[PDB]
C-alpha cells in the first residue's frame, strides 16, 4: 500500500538491478548540485549566524565542483570556524573562500573524492 | 613496443599523474631565488648533507650555456635527463641564430618536452619543477619556473619544494623596492629568506650568483658566514 | 575499474571525452563577441600571487596576422595545437598564395582532435576560441575536445560559462558596434572575477578589416577600464 | 569468473568459452540450408521481412567468391562479408599463380586456417560467422563444404545453419542425393524452407535460391526467382 | 590484455615511486661492500655469500669486476643483472676509448650507465634493474674517486660508502672512526678489517669470508691489485692484536 | 595453490605447476577417439576410428589419417582445428627440409621441430597452447619403422607402442599386458592386435566401416591407407 | 558487467556490447530522413543548435558530383569517413576515368569500419550515414551502422525518435514512387515534422534538404533556397 | 605479436623475485642428477625413469654434447631444456667462426647466463624452469659449472640438483673429496644417484657421460650396465 522505498550507494549488483524493472520503477540518479543550484544550499546557510550582504554565493559555487551540500556545509562552517579563531564576528565572502580554495585542494591530496572509480 | 596510455583523465576532470606527481616536487629539497636589477641570486637549501663526505657530485645548480643557470626541486634522477637534453638543444641554437640562447626559448623547450612527455604512450611524467635564470643578451635579467604540466611562468622570486607556501608567503614581506637596491642586499636577502627555510646552520645553504656578464660563481662558505653575521647582527639591531 | 581508454558508455559516448569536457570547467573564463566591424575578445589571466609577473602569461596568441585565438583550460596542451595550427596556415599559404580561411583552420585542427589510442594517449583538454577576418567577414569560432566545431556568435567558456552566456543573451543584438562590445565584455568580467578588475588582470584582443593591426598593447586598457 | 573473457585461456573443464560463445552467436540467426545433387549444388536462404525494411535484393547472404564457388552465410553479417573479401582474394592468388581454377578443398583449408587463426590470440575475437561453399567442375564433381566459427571444415551432402537448424535438417534424409536432378532439388528445397520457420514468429519472409552445377555450365549464379517460380506454386499446395 | 598488466611505472597515490622502493629493498639483502678514504691507494671490501667448502674458487674474482685498465666495480644484489650491466658498461668504456684514444673518466661512465637504469624506470612497463654497485678508479683530472649507484639512477661520490643494509652501521662506524687523508694503507686496511669485523656477525673474521681489492697508482701501470689470502691472514692477526691491545684499557 | 593470474595465462604457480598445459592435457578429451600405434618388426600400424552421427556427413572427409610426405604418415586426436593447423606446419617444414638439406627428412627430426614450435606456443604468455596431440609413423635407414608422439607440452617422444586420447589410460595398461612377452611381431599379428586392443576397450566388435588403418611396411615404404575390403579381411581374419 | 569491457569480449548471450553502445550513440543524434523515387533521391535532415546565438550544426555534407551523405552521431569520425569517402571516390575517378557506382562504394565502408570492430583497443565509429547517389541504374538510399551492416532500403530514418518517421513512411510507401520533386521533398520533411514535439516549429533556419538527380547535380540548400520549399504545408492537427 | 611486452616478473613487497622462486620450486620438482669433477675429467650422471615398460630409451638422450669436448645436462623440464640447448648449439658456433678456436666453457656459461638473465626481464614470458650442469675440458683443467633460472652461475666441485639435493648434497659433502680418478668419480656418482632411486637401476635408468681431457665421449649402455653391476 505504501510502495516501500529503496536507498543504497552503488548500483551494484546486477541481479537486484535487473529484478527491480519487473516490479519497481522510478530510478533516479543524483543530482548532486547544478552550477546554479549550489547557491540553494547557501540560501539555507545564509540564515546561519550573521551573513554580510557583500557575499556572493555564485562566486564560490563554481570553485567547488561536485561538493553537493556536504562539502559546502563546511564552507559556512570554516567561515564561522576561522571567525572565532580570528576572534572576529561575521565572515565576508573573501574571508572564508580563501580557506575554501584550501579545503577543496588540501583535502584532495590524499583523495580527490571521485565516484567514478567506485563502480569502475 | 610499449603501447599503453599511462596518463588519462579522471572523471572529475583532473589528470592524475600531472596533478599528483607534484608531490615529488613537494617532498624534495627547497630552492629559492630572486632577481636583482643587475645580479641574480639563486640557491638550494635543505641539502641534508652527510657532512663528512663529498659535495661536488651532489651539486644541483648547473649551467646549460654560461648565459643560463639551473635550479630545481624534486628527485634529481629525472632532472638529469631534462638538463642534458636541454643542453643538446641549446647548443644547436648556437649552431643556428648567432645570438646566445634567450632564456624564454629554453624554458619553452623544457616545458614543451615535458608536455609531450606527459602526452605520449607508456611514459611516466616527470616529477620535477625547475628554475631557469639568466641575464640574457641586451643585459636584461629575468627568471622562469617549470611545472610537470609544462607551464613556464615568469616570477619575480621563487619558492619551490618543501614549504613553498612558507617562503612564498615570506617574500611578500620582502618585495619592498628597497630590496634589492644593493647586490649585497640581494644575496643576504636570499639567505635571510632562507632563515625561515630549513635548519640554516650555515652548512646546507648553497648559493650561486651571476653578474650579468660573468660565468656563474659558486661561492665558497666564506661570505655566507659573514652574511649570517650581518644578518644576526641586524637582528641584534632589530630590538 | 580502469577499462579501455577508448571505450563507449552505456548511454553512451566516449568515456574519456566526457571526462575531458569537465576539465574545461575548472579553467579560466573568456568572452568572445562577433561584431559586424570585427571580433573583440576577452579573457582573465587569473593572477595567483603578487610574486608573479603578470604580463608573461599568454591567453591570446595570434595565429596568423589575420586570425586571432583564445585558449583555455590546460595551457600547455594548447601550445601544441597553436604551434601546429600555424604550420597548417603557412602550408596553405605556400601551396596556394592566399590566406587560409578561418573555417578550414578548425577543420585542420579538429581532424586531429581525436587521435588517442595505443597503436596508430589522452585527448586534449582545451577549449579554443578562434576569431579572425577572412573574405566571408569577421568570423568567431569555437572548438572543443570532441572536435565538434561550430560557429558561435557570442560564446563564453570555462567556469563562468553558465552565468556569462545566460547574462549575455540579454545584452546582445545583431547590430553591435565595436566600442560598445568592448565595454560590454568587461561588465561581465568584473561580475565574474574574484580579484579586483585593474590593469593587470584581463587582456582584450581585436581584429578588423580596417583596424589592423591593432593588436594588444597596454595603456589602451587603462582608458578602457576607466570608462566604467 | 575470469575464464570466459579472453579467448586464449582454457577453462578448467577443458574447453574454450569464447569459441563456445561464438558457436551460439550464429544460433540466433535465420535458417539457411544447402544440399547437393549428383551434378550440382543447390542453396537456399530464408530472409526476413517484417514490414517495410529494405528493397528486394538488399544485403544478399548469397555471395559469389569465384566463377564456380559461392557462399551462403548466416550469423553476424559484417564478418561474413570480411570472409567473402578474404576468400575472394585467396581465389585471386591461386588463379593468378598456378594457372587453373581453385579446387574447393584448398579454398576450404585456406579460409578455415584464417577462421582458426583468429582463435589463438587476445588481439582479435573469434569470428561469429558460418557459411556454405558450393561448387562444380567436370574433373571434380560437386562438393559442399561447411565452415563453423571454430575453424572445422568438412563435407556434407546437405546442411543447415540457423535458429531452426535441427528441424530444417530433419527432413533432408527423406530426400535422395544420388538419383535426383537438381532441377527437382530447387523446389525440393523450397518446400521445406517454406515449411520450416512457421509464420507465428515472423509474419512475412522472402526466399533466395542460388544454384551452381552442370546445367549452369560451371558458372555460379542466382536462379531467376520469377523464372519457373516453382517454389510457391508447390508451397501453397504443400500446407495440407 | 591490459588487465594482466602489472603497472611497474606509475606513481602510487601517497607520494613516492612504488617500485623503486621495492627495488632498494632487494639491495638491502645479500650484499656487503665498502671503500675507504685513501691517498695513494683505494680499497674495496667484499663478503662471501657462498662460503661452502664445495666451490671451485677458479674465477679469481667473486665480487670484483675489472672493467678497464684503471677501474673496477662491486656487484650488490641480483648478480646476473650486474652481469648485464658490466657488459654494457665495459662496452661503453671501450667505445669511449675508441672515439678519443684516451681513457674514460669515471663521472661520465657513471652517468652513461645511470641513464640506462633511469631509462627503464622512466618508461617501458618494465622490471627495473636491481643492482646498486660501487666504483673505484684513477683519472687524469681528479686523482682517485668513489661512486655509488641506485636503481633510480641517482649517483653520489663518497669517501666511505654503504652497501648494503648491514652497512648503515658501517656508516655510523665510519663517521665515528673518521679522518682526513691518512693512507698509509695499513691504517686503511686495519680500519676496513675492523669494520668488517664489528659489522659482520660471524666472529673473528675468517680468512675465506672476506675479500679486498686495492688499486695503487703506478706510472704508467695503474695496478689493480687483488690480494690473496696469505696477505689477508696476517692482516687479520694484526687487527686481533689491536683488539687485544685496545681492550686493556678496562 | 594459486597466486595472481596463474590460473589464466602460462605463468608459474607457487607449487611449481603451470595450469594451462595440464588443462591442455585434457583438451584432448573432448574429441572422443581411441588411436593406437603399434611398431612391429618390419612394419607399423596406425588404427583410429570415426563417428558418423549423420547420414549426410561424408566418409571421405572425416578421415584423421593425414599424410605428411611420401614416407611419413600421421594421425590426429584432440580438437579438430588445432589438429589441422598443426598439419600444414608439418608438411611445410618437411618440404623446407627437402629444399634446404636435399635428402628426405627422418621421422625423428620433424617431431623435434613441431615440439619446439609447440614450446614457443607454450613459452610466450599471450598465445593459446594448441590442445591437439600429434602421432607419427615412418621408416628410417637401418632403424626399422618408428612411432613418435608429440603432446602439446613441447616434447618429442616415441616408443614401441603408444596411444593417447580419451580412453587410453586403460589402453596403455592393456598394451603393457600385451607387449612384454616372448611374442614376435608379424604383420597380421600387429594388425590383429591393433584392432583387439581397441575392441577390449570399447567392447563393441563392430563393422569394418569404422576403423581407419594406415600402415607402413618396408617392402614398399610409402605410407598407405587401407581399402575397406582388406580391412574386412583383417577384421574377419581375427574372428576364429 | 565485466564482459562489457572491450570489443574483443563476446557475451554469454552472443551480443557484443560495444556495438550496442555504439548504436546508442547513433540514436542520440538528431533526426534525418532519406527517401527515393524511381527518378530522384531526396535526403532531408534537421539541425540542432547549442544555444540561441550559436549557429545550427550542419548535417548534410557534399561528397562527390553525385554521392551525398547525411550524418548523425559523432562529428570527428564523420570527417574521418568523409575524407576516406572523398579519397576512394577520386581514386577510381583518377584511375578508371569514370565515376563510381554507389553499391561498390559502401563495401569499402564496411571493410573500412570492420577492422576497428575486431582488433583490441579500437572503438567502432559512431556513424549515421544515409548514402544517396546515381549509378546508371537510378537512385539508391543506403544506411550504415557501427556494426557495418548496410541496408538497401527505399526509405529509412535514423536519429532521435526517428521511429515516428518510419511509421509515417509505411502508409505512404505505395505512393513514394511516381511523384516528382516538389511534393517528394515535402513528403520527405513531413516525417521530420513528426519527429518533433507538436508545439514548436518546423522553422526555416534549421532544415537542410539535399537532392541528387540525372540532370541535377547533388545540391545542398540552406534556409533560403529552402524557404521556397517550406511554403504551402498543411497545419499540424489538434 | 601485439607489443604488449610488459614484464610480468615484478618485485614483491619484501623485495623477492617471485617467479624466480617459483621456478626454483619447479626445478625442485624435477628429476635428480649429480655431477662430479675429479682431477682428470668431469663425470655427469642423470636419472631417467621411463614411466612404463612401453617406452623406448634409445630415442631421447639427456647427456647432450655441445662441442666435441663440452657436455650439458639439466634438472627441470625438458621442453624448456631443449630450447636453450639449441641456443647454446648456435651460440658456440659464432665463437668458432669469429675466433677459429674451441670455445671455453667459462665463455659458454657467461653467454648462456646472459641469455637466461636477459630472458627473465623481457616481454611477457615465464622464465625457464631448467637448472643446468655444464662440463668440459679446456686448457688442461676440467671445469664444472651450474646455472639456474635466476641466470646466476656457480663453480662447484661436485654438486647435485633435482630431488633430494640436500640429501645428495650432504652425501657429496663427505663422500666426495680431494681427488679421485675418472672411474672413481663414476662410483660415487652412481652411488649418489642410487641415494634416491627406485628398487632397481639398470642401463635404461641411469645415463652417464664423461669428459676426457683428450675429448668428450658419451658412454654406452654396455659400460653403463657394466659399472652398475657392482651396485655402485
PDB file of C-alpha atoms in Angstrom, chain A residues 7-104:
ATOM      1  CA  UNK A   7      18.280   3.637  -0.993  1.00  0.00           C
ATOM      2  CA  UNK A   8      21.867   2.479  -1.445  1.00  0.00           C
ATOM      3  CA  UNK A   9      25.315   3.651  -2.541  1.00  0.00           C
ATOM      4  CA  UNK A  10      26.398   1.920  -5.763  1.00  0.00           C
ATOM      5  CA  UNK A  11      24.004   0.479  -8.374  1.00  0.00           C
ATOM      6  CA  UNK A  12      25.515  -2.968  -7.636  1.00  0.00           C
ATOM      7  CA  UNK A  13      24.704  -5.652  -8.047  1.00  0.00           C
ATOM      8  CA  UNK A  14      23.339  -6.712 -11.433  1.00  0.00           C
ATOM      9  CA  UNK A  15      20.807  -9.269 -10.187  1.00  0.00           C
ATOM     10  CA  UNK A  16      18.866  -6.919  -7.844  1.00  0.00           C
ATOM     11  CA  UNK A  17      19.225  -4.240 -10.525  1.00  0.00           C
ATOM     12  CA  UNK A  18      17.627  -6.418 -13.210  1.00  0.00           C
ATOM     13  CA  UNK A  19      14.907  -7.661 -10.843  1.00  0.00           C
ATOM     14  CA  UNK A  20      13.500  -4.231  -9.973  1.00  0.00           C
ATOM     15  CA  UNK A  21      12.359  -3.161 -13.504  1.00  0.00           C
ATOM     16  CA  UNK A  22       9.942  -6.093 -13.442  1.00  0.00           C
ATOM     17  CA  UNK A  23       8.442  -4.700 -10.234  1.00  0.00           C
ATOM     18  CA  UNK A  24       9.811  -1.353  -9.066  1.00  0.00           C
ATOM     19  CA  UNK A  25      10.067   1.905 -11.019  1.00  0.00           C
ATOM     20  CA  UNK A  26      11.385   5.471 -10.692  1.00  0.00           C
ATOM     21  CA  UNK A  27      15.144   5.010 -10.772  1.00  0.00           C
ATOM     22  CA  UNK A  28      16.779   8.434 -10.461  1.00  0.00           C
ATOM     23  CA  UNK A  29      20.444   9.410 -10.461  1.00  0.00           C
ATOM     24  CA  UNK A  30      21.788  12.210  -8.286  1.00  0.00           C
ATOM     25  CA  UNK A  31      21.828  15.249  -8.803  1.00  0.00           C
ATOM     26  CA  UNK A  32      24.101  16.406  -6.948  1.00  0.00           C
ATOM     27  CA  UNK A  33      24.231  20.203  -7.381  1.00  0.00           C
ATOM     28  CA  UNK A  34      23.630  22.207 -10.511  1.00  0.00           C
ATOM     29  CA  UNK A  35      26.063  25.040 -11.198  1.00  0.00           C
ATOM     30  CA  UNK A  36      23.198  27.432 -10.441  1.00  0.00           C
ATOM     31  CA  UNK A  37      21.919  25.140  -7.682  1.00  0.00           C
ATOM     32  CA  UNK A  38      24.902  25.376  -5.339  1.00  0.00           C
ATOM     33  CA  UNK A  39      23.558  28.708  -4.077  1.00  0.00           C
ATOM     34  CA  UNK A  40      20.391  26.997  -2.818  1.00  0.00           C
ATOM     35  CA  UNK A  41      22.380  25.143  -0.150  1.00  0.00           C
ATOM     36  CA  UNK A  42      23.904  28.555   0.560  1.00  0.00           C
ATOM     37  CA  UNK A  43      20.416  30.055   0.942  1.00  0.00           C
ATOM     38  CA  UNK A  44      19.528  27.852   3.924  1.00  0.00           C
ATOM     39  CA  UNK A  45      23.069  28.568   5.150  1.00  0.00           C
ATOM     40  CA  UNK A  46      22.511  32.300   4.567  1.00  0.00           C
ATOM     41  CA  UNK A  47      20.384  32.221   7.724  1.00  0.00           C
ATOM     42  CA  UNK A  48      23.316  30.768   9.683  1.00  0.00           C
ATOM     43  CA  UNK A  49      25.000  33.141  12.164  1.00  0.00           C
ATOM     44  CA  UNK A  50      25.398  36.633  10.592  1.00  0.00           C
ATOM     45  CA  UNK A  51      25.910  36.868   6.821  1.00  0.00           C
ATOM     46  CA  UNK A  52      27.317  40.037   5.275  1.00  0.00           C
ATOM     47  CA  UNK A  53      25.379  41.451   2.329  1.00  0.00           C
ATOM     48  CA  UNK A  54      28.544  41.754   0.223  1.00  0.00           C
ATOM     49  CA  UNK A  55      28.873  37.968  -0.009  1.00  0.00           C
ATOM     50  CA  UNK A  56      28.225  36.486  -3.459  1.00  0.00           C
ATOM     51  CA  UNK A  57      27.246  32.813  -3.410  1.00  0.00           C
ATOM     52  CA  UNK A  58      27.525  32.477  -7.194  1.00  0.00           C
ATOM     53  CA  UNK A  59      31.241  33.280  -6.980  1.00  0.00           C
ATOM     54  CA  UNK A  60      32.337  30.446  -4.691  1.00  0.00           C
ATOM     55  CA  UNK A  61      29.898  27.901  -6.152  1.00  0.00           C
ATOM     56  CA  UNK A  62      31.953  27.252  -9.297  1.00  0.00           C
ATOM     57  CA  UNK A  63      35.199  26.920  -7.318  1.00  0.00           C
ATOM     58  CA  UNK A  64      33.985  23.755  -5.518  1.00  0.00           C
ATOM     59  CA  UNK A  65      32.834  21.186  -8.098  1.00  0.00           C
ATOM     60  CA  UNK A  66      30.913  18.076  -7.028  1.00  0.00           C
ATOM     61  CA  UNK A  67      30.687  19.430  -3.468  1.00  0.00           C
ATOM     62  CA  UNK A  68      26.938  18.716  -3.078  1.00  0.00           C
ATOM     63  CA  UNK A  69      25.622  20.116   0.193  1.00  0.00           C
ATOM     64  CA  UNK A  70      28.075  18.265   2.419  1.00  0.00           C
ATOM     65  CA  UNK A  71      31.346  19.851   1.291  1.00  0.00           C
ATOM     66  CA  UNK A  72      29.888  23.372   1.111  1.00  0.00           C
ATOM     67  CA  UNK A  73      28.334  22.858   4.542  1.00  0.00           C
ATOM     68  CA  UNK A  74      31.963  23.114   5.677  1.00  0.00           C
ATOM     69  CA  UNK A  75      32.280  26.434   3.790  1.00  0.00           C
ATOM     70  CA  UNK A  76      29.884  28.209   6.153  1.00  0.00           C
ATOM     71  CA  UNK A  77      31.443  26.068   8.896  1.00  0.00           C
ATOM     72  CA  UNK A  78      35.042  27.053   8.101  1.00  0.00           C
ATOM     73  CA  UNK A  79      33.553  30.553   7.835  1.00  0.00           C
ATOM     74  CA  UNK A  80      32.490  30.541  11.483  1.00  0.00           C
ATOM     75  CA  UNK A  81      35.377  28.211  12.356  1.00  0.00           C
ATOM     76  CA  UNK A  82      38.137  30.673  11.438  1.00  0.00           C
ATOM     77  CA  UNK A  83      35.864  33.526  12.560  1.00  0.00           C
ATOM     78  CA  UNK A  84      36.242  32.611  16.236  1.00  0.00           C
ATOM     79  CA  UNK A  85      39.874  31.604  15.612  1.00  0.00           C
ATOM     80  CA  UNK A  86      40.476  35.182  14.451  1.00  0.00           C
ATOM     81  CA  UNK A  87      38.129  36.462  17.228  1.00  0.00           C
ATOM     82  CA  UNK A  88      36.041  38.307  14.606  1.00  0.00           C
ATOM     83  CA  UNK A  89      32.243  38.018  14.379  1.00  0.00           C
ATOM     84  CA  UNK A  90      30.876  37.792  10.810  1.00  0.00           C
ATOM     85  CA  UNK A  91      32.619  36.232   7.798  1.00  0.00           C
ATOM     86  CA  UNK A  92      32.889  38.085   4.498  1.00  0.00           C
ATOM     87  CA  UNK A  93      32.989  36.155   1.216  1.00  0.00           C
ATOM     88  CA  UNK A  94      36.722  36.715   0.635  1.00  0.00           C
ATOM     89  CA  UNK A  95      37.354  35.634   4.242  1.00  0.00           C
ATOM     90  CA  UNK A  96      36.229  32.005   4.092  1.00  0.00           C
ATOM     91  CA  UNK A  97      36.620  31.479   0.331  1.00  0.00           C
ATOM     92  CA  UNK A  98      40.373  31.885   0.795  1.00  0.00           C
ATOM     93  CA  UNK A  99      40.060  28.899   3.126  1.00  0.00           C
ATOM     94  CA  UNK A 100      37.588  27.199   0.762  1.00  0.00           C
ATOM     95  CA  UNK A 101      40.100  27.010  -2.083  1.00  0.00           C
ATOM     96  CA  UNK A 102      42.315  25.295   0.509  1.00  0.00           C
ATOM     97  CA  UNK A 103      39.614  22.950   1.835  1.00  0.00           C
ATOM     98  CA  UNK A 104      38.995  21.589  -1.671  1.00  0.00           C
TER      99      UNK A 104
END
